[PDB]
């Protein structure tokens, strides 16, 4: 292979690896915020579903 092919093939390799490296750093930062704040799709732990509640009038009024 001529030097130009190897040289520009290297640049293509470096671009992919640097792009992956940035995403690996971003993912660790996003995970840290999501776990600490609970405001994202991840670390979303269940709470009781509110559709289970019965809202019809009850045998007694104070409820």
């Amino acid at each position: 292979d001529g030097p130009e092919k190897n040289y520009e093939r290297t640049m293509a390799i470096l671009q992919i690896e640097a792009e992956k490296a940035e995403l690996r750093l971003k993912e660790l930062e996003v995970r840290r915020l999501m776990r600490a704040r609970g405001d994202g799709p991840w670390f979303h732990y269940p709470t009781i579903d509110k559709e289970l509640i019965d809202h019809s009038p009850k045998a007694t009024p104070d409820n």
Binding site: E19, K20, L23, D39, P41, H44
Partner: protein, 57 residues
């Protein structure tokens, strides 16, 4: 002139005309927490695959 109600009558659900306003927050509920921001968009393939260590897919 009192006529005894028939079997079944007093267990009917009836309607009442009331001047009283309808309560708005009878439970005294606080404002509910805002829901989590909603993820949306078009699902695209993961950039460069799993990105797990050395794997290229």
């Amino acid at each position: 002139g009192w006529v005894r109600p028939d079997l079944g009558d007093l267990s009917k659900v009836t309607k009442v005309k009331t001047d009283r306003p309808l309560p708005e927050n009878p439970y005294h509920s606080r404002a509910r927490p805002e829901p989590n921001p909603e993820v949306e968009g078009d699902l695209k393939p993961a950039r460069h695959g799993s990105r797990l260590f050395f794997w290229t897919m």
